[PDB]
Design a protein around this ligand. Structure first.
Ligand SMILES: Nc1nc2c(ncn2[C@@H]2O[C@H](COP(=O)(O)OP(=O)(O)OP(O)(O)=S)[C@@H](O)[C@H]2O)c(=O)[nH]1
Ligand SMILES: [Mg+2]
Ligand code: NA
Length: 345
């Protein structure tokens, strides 16, 4: 009686890939933001999270669902951005641990690179369903764009030189995946999603292929991800970062992976001075489709259902530890037991 339309969960998708492959730029094109331009050195140094309500995903896939026949079943999707720079393997591992499905970004002009291989191992270890965004197609020489088009509609319009270049680069990337033990196919040439990795060509600059990628991730959620993860179960939450925010004191940014968090909840998490026990005074999200990791305006909530990226204002968070689990003390819980439990992992 819990696997039904009244208990749906928004799943979590991680975007992984080698440095400078376009992971942040793809998310900026989806959000209609400019986070990448605001990063020092254009380098992502923190895990990001953006929530997409299913209404926005429907709109942003309309050009590859013109007849309206694709059935959306998820309520929304939380997408996690991760660093590609070699020095952030800990945050790729943390992000991957949180996700239920993933996009692996490959620059079509460079193929598989060391952090591509690292990310592929993280996904395989957790049996995470994924597709590959073969990004930067606009760098094919003579590429002719239509902004935000479906990949097939745009590829049909390309000259013979571009089609040959695309095919050569696609074949090279397929060979590299096979050398790593993965069979792969262009996503409309793929007979089986499970058997072979789907490859979806994209441009974060023109937006082409992004509708196809969004449709594919929704299909991964509804068709490949364990069905139990489409529905809410016990609370799971993880601290990402500790940030002082004007008006809200020292706050924490948290991925709520499962269950429901409520304003007023008694929470326990790891701290530098020992376990922190406190009460949520404000339970915040960014606006839809805006990054948790960028300071902005916030929406206040009495409750937030998973999965979401939230900011919590509460007394006593100064020494909160990134990576900590976060537990909610229920009526029959022993608070000291919960303390021992967050510090045990
Ligand atoms: N031509 C072209 N350039 C792109 C595309 N996607 C990203 N870029 C460019 O590549 C550079 C890196 O993009 P960025 O979004 O920072 O990658 P990233 O994967 O997030 O990088 P990081 O967090 O691992 S350091 C930027 O200059 C961006 O404009 C694309 O589709 N086409
Ligand atoms: Mg980035
Ligand atoms: Na970058």
């Amino acid at each position: 009686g819990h696997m039904n339309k009244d208990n749906l969960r928004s799943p979590i998708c991680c975007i992984l890939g080698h440095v400078d492959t376009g992971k942040t730029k793809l998310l900026d094109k989806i959000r209609q933001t400019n986070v990448q331009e605001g990063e020092a050195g254009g380098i992502t140094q923190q895990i990001g999270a953006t929530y997409f309500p299913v209404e926005a995903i429907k709109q942003k896939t309309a050009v590859v669902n013109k007849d309206g026949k694709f059935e959306f079943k998820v309520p929304g999707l939380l997408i996690i951005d991760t660093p590609g720079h070699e020095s952030f393997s800990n945050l790729r591992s943390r992000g991957s641990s949180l996700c239920n499905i993933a996009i692996l970004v490959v620059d079509i002009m460079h193929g598989l690179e060391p952090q591509t291989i690292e990310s592929l191992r993280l996904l395989r270890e957790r049996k995470t369903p994924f597709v590959v965004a073969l990004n930067k197609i606009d760098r094919l020489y003579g590429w002719k764009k239509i902004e935000n088009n479906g990949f097939r509609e745009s590829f049909a319009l390309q000259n013979k030189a571009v089609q040959n270049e695309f095919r050569n680069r696609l074949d090279q990337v397929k060979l590299q995946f096979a050398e790593q033990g993965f069979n792969s196919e262009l996503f409309y040439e793929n007979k089986n999603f499970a058997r072979y990795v789907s490859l979806v060509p994209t441009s974060a600059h023109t937006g082409e292929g992004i509708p196809d990628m969004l449709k594919l991730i929704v299909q991964l959620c509804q068709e490949r991800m364990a069905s139990s993860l489409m529905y809410l179960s016990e609370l799971q939450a993880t601290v990402l970062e500790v940030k002082a925010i004007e008006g809200f004191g020292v706050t924490i940014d948290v991925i709520l992976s499962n269950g429901i968090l409520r304003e007023g909840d008694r929470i326990v998490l790891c701290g530098l001075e020992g376990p922190i026990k406190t009460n949520i005074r404000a339970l915040l999200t960014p606006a839809p489709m805006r990054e948790l990791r960028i300071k902005g305006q916030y929406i206040h909530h009495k409750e937030v259902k998973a999965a979401q990226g939230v900011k919590i204002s509460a007394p006593g968070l100064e020494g909160a530890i990134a990576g900590s689990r976060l537990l909610v003390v229920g009526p029959d819980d022993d608070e000291e037991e919960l303390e021992e439990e967050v510090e045990s992992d």
